[PDB]
From Swiss-Prot, chains A, B:
There is a cross-link at residue 9 (Glycyl lysine isopeptide (Lys-Gly) (interchain with G-Cter in SUMO2)). The gene is MVP. The chain holds residues 696 to 745 of 893 of the full protein. It is found in: Cytoplasm; Nucleus, Nuclear pore complex; Cytoplasm, Perinuclear region. Present in most normal tissues. Higher expression observed in epithelial cells with secretory and excretory functions, as well as in cells chronically exposed to xenobiotics, such as bronchial cells and cells lining the intestine. Overexpressed in many multidrug-resistant cancer cells. Induction: Up-regulated by IFNG/IFN-gamma. Required for normal vault structure. Vaults are multi-subunit structures that may act as scaffolds for proteins involved in signal transduction. Vaults may also play a role in nucleo-cytoplasmic transport. Down-regulates IFNG-mediated STAT1 signaling and subsequent activation of JAK. Down-regulates SRC activity and signaling through MAP kinases. Phosphorylated on Tyr residues after EGF stimulation. The vault ribonucleoprotein particle is a huge (400 A x 670 A) cage structure of 12.9 MDa. It consists of a dimer of half-vaults, with each half-vault comprising 39 identical major vault protein (MVP) chains, PARP4 and one or more vault RNAs (vRNAs). Interacts with TEP1. Interacts with PTEN and activated MAPK1. The phosphorylated protein interacts with the SH2 domains of PTPN11 and SRC. Interacts with APEX1. May interact with ZNF540. MVP 3 mediates interaction with PTEN. MVP 4 mediates interaction with PARP4. It comes from the Eukaryota. This is Major vault protein. It comes from Homo sapiens.
Amino acid sequence: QSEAEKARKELLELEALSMAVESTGTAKAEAESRAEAARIEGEGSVLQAK
Amino acid sequence: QSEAEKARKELLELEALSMAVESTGTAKAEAESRAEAARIEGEGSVLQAK
């Protein structure tokens, strides 16, 4: 069981890296989509105001 | 399982890229459609005012 835990430590490190990658990817994708939509809406608003 | 997680990290990176592409594409498409509609409506409004 000690040897199994020795391997499980590295396995958990890899799992943590994968989880961080997935979470940051999802968050950045949603944030960038919303930001692009807001920028387009703002430019349209400027033109409509003119 | 450690090797499987090693591969899964790259798989999740690719999935994050694909998700970001899809989200930004949908958002920008909807925003640009609404902006074009607003611009056409504004030009029509100017002509109607004249």
